[PDB]
Amino acid sequence: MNNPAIQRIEDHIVKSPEDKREYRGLELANGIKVLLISDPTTDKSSAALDVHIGSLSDPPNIPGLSHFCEHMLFLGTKKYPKENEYSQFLSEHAGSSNAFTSGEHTNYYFDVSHEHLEGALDRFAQFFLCPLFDASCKDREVNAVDSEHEKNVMNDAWRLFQLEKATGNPKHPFSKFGTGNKYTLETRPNQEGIDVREELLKFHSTYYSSNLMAICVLGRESLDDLTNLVVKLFSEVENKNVPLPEFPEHPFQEEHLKQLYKIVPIKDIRNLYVTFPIPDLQQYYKSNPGHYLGHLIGHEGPGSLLSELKSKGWVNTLVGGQKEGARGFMFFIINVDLTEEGLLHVEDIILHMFQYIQKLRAEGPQEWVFQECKDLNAVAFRFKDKERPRGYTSKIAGKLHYYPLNGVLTAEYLLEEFRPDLIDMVLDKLRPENVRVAIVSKSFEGKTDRTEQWYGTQYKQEAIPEDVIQKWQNADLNGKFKLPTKNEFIPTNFEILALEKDATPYPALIKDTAMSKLWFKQDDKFFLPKACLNFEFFSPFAYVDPLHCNMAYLYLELLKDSLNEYAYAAELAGLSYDLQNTIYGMYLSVKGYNDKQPILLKKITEKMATFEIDKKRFEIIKEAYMRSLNNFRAEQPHQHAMYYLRLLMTEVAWTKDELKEALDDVTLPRLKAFIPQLLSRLHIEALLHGNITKQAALGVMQMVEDTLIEHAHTKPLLPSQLVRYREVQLPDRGWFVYQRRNEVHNNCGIEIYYQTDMQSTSENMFLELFCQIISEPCFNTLRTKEQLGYIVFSGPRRANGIQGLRFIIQSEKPPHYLESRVEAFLITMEKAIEDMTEEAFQKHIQALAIRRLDKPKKLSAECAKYWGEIISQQYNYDRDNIEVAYLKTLSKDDIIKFYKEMLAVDAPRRHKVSVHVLAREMLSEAPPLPQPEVIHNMTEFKRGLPLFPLVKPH
Amino acid sequence: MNNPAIQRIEDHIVKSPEDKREYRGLELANGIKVLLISDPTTDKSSAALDVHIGSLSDPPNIPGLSHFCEHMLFLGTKKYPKENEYSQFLSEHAGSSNAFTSGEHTNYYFDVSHEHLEGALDRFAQFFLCPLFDASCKDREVNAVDSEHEKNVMNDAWRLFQLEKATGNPKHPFSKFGTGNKYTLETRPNQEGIDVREELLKFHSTYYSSNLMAICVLGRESLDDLTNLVVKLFSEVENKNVPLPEFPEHPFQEEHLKQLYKIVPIKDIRNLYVTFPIPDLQQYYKSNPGHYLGHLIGHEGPGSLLSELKSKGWVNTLVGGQKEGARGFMFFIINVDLTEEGLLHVEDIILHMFQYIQKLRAEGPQEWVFQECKDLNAVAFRFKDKERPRGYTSKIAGKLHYYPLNGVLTAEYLLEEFRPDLIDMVLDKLRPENVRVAIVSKSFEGKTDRTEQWYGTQYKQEAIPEDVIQKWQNADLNGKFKLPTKNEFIPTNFEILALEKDATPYPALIKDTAMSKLWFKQDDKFFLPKACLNFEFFSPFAYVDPLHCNMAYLYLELLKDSLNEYAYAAELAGLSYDLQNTIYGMYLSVKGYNDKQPILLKKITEKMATFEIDKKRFEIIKEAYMRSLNNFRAEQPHQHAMYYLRLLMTEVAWTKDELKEALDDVTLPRLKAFIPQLLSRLHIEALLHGNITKQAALGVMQMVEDTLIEHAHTKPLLPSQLVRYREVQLPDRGWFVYQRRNEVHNNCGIEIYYQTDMQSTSENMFLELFCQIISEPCFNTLRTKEQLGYIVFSGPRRANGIQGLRFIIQSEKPPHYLESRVEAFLITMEKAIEDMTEEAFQKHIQALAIRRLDKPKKLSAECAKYWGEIISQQYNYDRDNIEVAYLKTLSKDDIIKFYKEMLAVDAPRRHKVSVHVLAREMLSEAPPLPQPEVIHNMTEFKRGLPLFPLVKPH
Ligand SMILES: [Zn+2]
Ligand SMILES: [Zn+2]
């Protein structure tokens, strides 16, 4: 009795009783699986389509095809032949899109204003119906892909990824190179007279079949309205009845096992990777055997494998569990980072792993463990935070390929039967004879003889000697390991407290003392049993010089290192914390189920106040911290650019260079002395937000205060005697340039900042609307058309109460060239703005309005919004509505005069600074530009300029 | 064979062989005594005339007449009838004048450009020849005198001064009131039909006789040229042959002795004053009996009376010795300040004094002591710093009344015969039966029954009970007192080191390390055996908050308290030091004979590095420091004004209020911990200047460095990681006002500041030339004519590399009235500047030029000049010549446009701040003024304004 285009309708989708969204699953006649989500409150609608095809289906001779195909779909269809019709449509309607390609999936997703779902969905639909694959774009777009590959080339994590593939069965599609590059997608095909367009076409035509598609749509419309919409657009996707690709034979056969790999890293990291090929456990998902094992082997704290490796001083962290491979095969991994001692005892570390493993084989599957994970996952599912539409649809679209419509939401959370046999079955794979081992360290440099061809990774490959293997097999039973004890952080009280009669819409100051200032709001819209607790501890000793900065950091690092064990239970139990040093002191934040927060917070605080440093932990953390600093040189050029601009523009800021040099002066006794000093006088400013009453909030603050007082004899620090850092004020018509060399990458990174003014309602919206207007043309001009690089970013930069327009680019091309093109782009944006209809202009205002008014869907997000106002000392909780009202009054002329005053090459109030990070080895008309003054010493540079006021609060 | 106008010529004046000035003494026929000083290098010439008449010669019914007469002489003579002819002449020729009246002297003095000595001396001469005593001025000027008295009314030191007089013989002229006021000089005389003008005339005519005059003149001209000059102008002063006043009978007879006075102070001070009437010892000056006694009784450190009173915790400081009375009588005094314990043990303190005294009577005069003082004074005289002309002439003119022409310079330094009998004679006066005692404390408030009539001082007068007196008489011998041991700081090496081949004209950076930066110059022009050693120790812990500021202060106070004893010998031996906390850390400076500097510096440094705090000293210093803070409220309104403007204009600055509140949190353990922290990391910047070689300079720096390293394990602090404080940048056309109440005085104090710009050669000279131009009209308009108060000051204000025009006034009238008159004055200065000849304008430029180019005459002064450049981090050692060259290029138009740009009521770049300090109880056309924004919170005020850059160094 259905619409003839619908094979089946699932009207009972299992969801959480907490979830007010309405859900209907469909199975279209053409095979498409569909989850429709009706949310009448949502400000943004969203859709995602997942093609169950990916890079593993690339033709042998055109590796990267499935990825290039992804890129191309954005760039024109027969119905919508404009190359950025899609992206320009989304931009002008508060929307955004993205997509990715893995081995078996290509997932495309967008969100958009709820009033324009049909229009966006319609343009989106055409990708799977009538792409153009325009030869004009094909040549240009290949660059973005190549640039995207070059982005990753020097990234350790992408290097390892690809190298594990090149070390398997060469025959197996697992071995193929996914990303592609100019060579694979252009050069090699041309040498050999192969038309990659005929190929994109043939690919799209053989694999882009309705029977391998899954869709998820979230809108305001009724499930019924949505159903007709989806059928209307998608029911006519051709079903090619292509068989779902399958990979039964494991890419790692015997001649690939019992192998050792010595790898040269880009960063100076010490890492041990231990891998076991396992069968695909996807089918056994309602008992989840690999995670049961992942949970135990990767467990942290008391008795765990990690505690031990930590105590011996070999390893700092550990990750264990199941790793996805592809339909037919998976991996089970144990990865750890190595201390200097660790690197010399790899063979024993591996022995200790097998001992832990042995204990499990002897002990057997534990009913209670599985039952505890089960109980946790269930609470997690029921009280799961409301998701952002874009991430939610994209995720669901992916999940539809693996689970019944009615189980698509609960799958991967809700376990059912315990299956001891399945656990045992996997456990049997975990053996020396089945192991691959990879050591990553610069202590291998110069002494490898192999180059992976896509990344150029340097490595040695050798067989683990039998005497070793056998030692591992003969791994006995270490009485030092032992099973996790019961989780006592498991929440039990989920009662949502009645809203108090006094409850406020925004956080209210309910305590204003010398020692503590306390902002509190009781949750009035999400109603989950969660709280967010944030504390900023202010002390001048935290940032007085590079040495105290180094000392505050190491103090927290060591505190966290000391708490891990105990806190790991809480983390499993959905109760998490973060602790970090700031330029004002320390930042402590607790989030999760409110129930047992007092227990963790009390322990955290008592801990800081009574901290006794272990000498060995100290020396290890400090070594790591040292490497961490040096390691910054291996970071992306664009991240260097953003880093130095930050340091440049703030009154006081210690560089990684200053910190490294002052680090040697840090010693255990000096640090020991430092702690009490740091703790002796403090001011605290807090936001306690969620399922809590005023009464409870104050009780929490008091525990924290009184704890510090009794254990570190803390006394108040008057807020008025706390210095706050100002932003550097650039001169009218000034242009400064700061130049550094990136010693790792062959791309340069540039950040161009045009300082405007102190933040205020008017200035903010001039800036943000101008940004909104150029946001997508920036992408379309500098990346799509000019193809200057994969990383091309424009937008608002805010700090220390000041703001301005920033551009960020990572490019093969040099900084002075980027500059000109950016300036060439600005001229263009001006004219485009003059020649803009009042209608296109109103769209943009409406676009930015929806983006700003789009409310947080969860507590932690709303909490972070509030925390931003507190941290900045602006306390502007109604900022969104006030700022959007002003925004709607702006006209084209407002924006023109703004640009001419602050942004034009010849603007009287142009305040430009550029940060050029040079690659290791270093069209529309661009204007003539002044000669920049070049900064050689950041300190001198700041001394010779004025500083801004601090923003007034509300 | 002399000029007939000269009775005698002394051509052998005893001077120091070091002194290149030429000296001739004359005795004019008319009785005038004269010292002529030829100095061909001097940039400024100078004269002083001392009339051996003062307030003790005031007529009974017009007290203050001799003082009013002084004032009036400045205001017109028959030859030069213009009321400010004199002062305007000096101003326009780089000169200045002042005068004072004591009991027996009226001393008038001026300096002026060396090229205009005759013209100035000529106008000056007329004061003693043909004053006008103009009725128009007489009425106006009385105000200045009254205002001058009101300035002093609330000053404890002037209150006590006058009260000791009102407590003597009422018959004796000593009892008269010196300053005068509107009442004595106008009101009472009018009630009783007495013409004070007939009186000024009669006074001048009976007492202003050549036979009571002494003159001293210092010029470039030859002694012969000077002789003719002096005779020309002064030989015709009428000799009235008036007998020199004499006061043989002591103003304190028996019925005035054995008295006790309980006095109520304005400040909260605890002071004990012990006084003995002695005979006049003026005649015994070449053995100096009262100073021999003054030296011993006032001695500090080992064995001394003070050490003991200190150890018992009663007294913090002590002053003892002879005090001038007037021809015929003197006093011998012992004054101490009291701790809280001290105030309850006054009677025992006094007993301990008499015990020390007893020891002296038993021990008898000590030949070696007198001989040691003798040797010291002789070195002091020989190596005396070259004096500034104005202070030198004024002093000499006074000295001529007491000593042979040929002994006028050496007198009071060079002793001759030891006279044991004279010592004994004075010592006999020092007895309980001859003592007056005065306790000054707020613990007397409300319970006195006497009012001194001139100051209104509140006090009780009672007779020391005989049982007490007798106890003092029965004072035995305390074995705890003991005679000063030999002074080992007595210098012995006076060799002046040859100037090195490399010697530089300005200090040169001869060391530039992480830990120490060292500026050094070898003296190339004074050639005395002296050095100046200045160290600024930089540490952030010194000013991080009010508590650390309080802690750095108390640390130094206690260090100095602990060193006194040991260092007092060095001080006697012309080797002095200063130690004080600064906003950047600590400041240490040593000056004097270079010989034994290393000994003192070594001891000072070792001391800081190894300081062990005594608990009792701590509690006492801290009490004092507490009182010190509160006591600030009793300071002059104009000093409050200058104080709050300073705090207002600097980025960071703790108020006396913040410091008092944070003081309670200071404790011995907290302070003990603070010291090592403070000393652990340091940067040092030093100027070592004088009779020292490069080699020696570096050796001194190294001792200081290595001392700290070995005793407080100091490590370097990178100069680049040291934050420096910026000045607040006021907005264009802004006007802020900060208002406070002075709770003691009945005058208000105002400081008006017009911020101009960052310092630079051009800006500096615009400012200083404008100041030079208005300097004297300011005085003549606001004080002389408008009579707004005694304190009326205009000039340049410099700080944190910024500058501006400041006006300071203390007035009966309210702040808003002062403001208008000041603004009324500015309009006037503008027109006056437009209507100014190029000739009057060039004079002003030439005036300011001479003032700026006038070189230091001694080492410590040149050293302070250099230190200013270092402390400010401008290092502009040639500043004077460079700035004067620019100054000579300026024109009237330059100054006009400057005024219109920065200073006019409607100037676009007017940056005005005012500080109004309200009295306890609160014509040319003034412009309309804006409504000021009023500052209620200095902190908020600074946060909302930008900050200036720091000046670039050279
Ligand atoms: Zn891509
Ligand atoms: Zn006077």
Residue numbers in the entry:
A (entry chain A), B (entry chain A): 42 to 963, 980 to 1011
Article, verbatim:
Insulysin (EC 3.4.24.56; also referred to as insulin-degrading enzyme or IDE) is a zinc metallopeptidase in the M16 family that has been extensively studied because of its role in cellular insulin degradation and amyloid beta peptide catabolism. IDE exists predominantly as a dimer in equilibrium with tetramers and to a lesser extent monomers. It is unique among the enzymes comprising the zinc metallopeptidase M16 family in that it exhibits allosteric kinetic behavior with substrate peptides increasing its activity. Crystal structures of human IDE (hIDE) complexed with peptides show that the enzyme consists of four structurally related domains that adopt a clamshell-like structure enclosing a large central chamber.
We report here the crystal structures of rat IDE (rIDE) and a catalytically compromised mutant form, rIDE-E111F. The structures of wild type and E111F rIDE are very similar to the published structures of peptide bound and unliganded human IDE (hIDE). The four structurally similar domains each have an α+β fold and arrange to form the same closed clamshell conformation as hIDE, with the N- and C-terminal halves of the clamshell connected by a single polypeptide chain. In the closed conformation, the two halves of the clamshell are in contact with one another forming an enclosed cavity, and the active site of the enzyme is accessible from this internal substrate-binding chamber. Bound peptides are presumably not seen associated with wild type rIDE because the polyhistidine fusion sequences are degraded by the active enzyme. Comparison of the ligand free rIDE structure and the rIDE-E111F structure with ligand bound at the distal and active sites suggests a likely structural basis for allosterism. As already noted, the crystallographic thermal factors for the first two domains of the ligand bound mutant are consistently higher than those for the unliganded enzyme. This difference may reflect a higher relative mobility of the two halves of the peptide bound enzyme, which would be consistent with a weakening of the interface. The observed conformational shift at the dimer interface between ligand free wild type enzyme and ligand bound rIDE-E111F reported here suggests a possible structural basis for this communication.
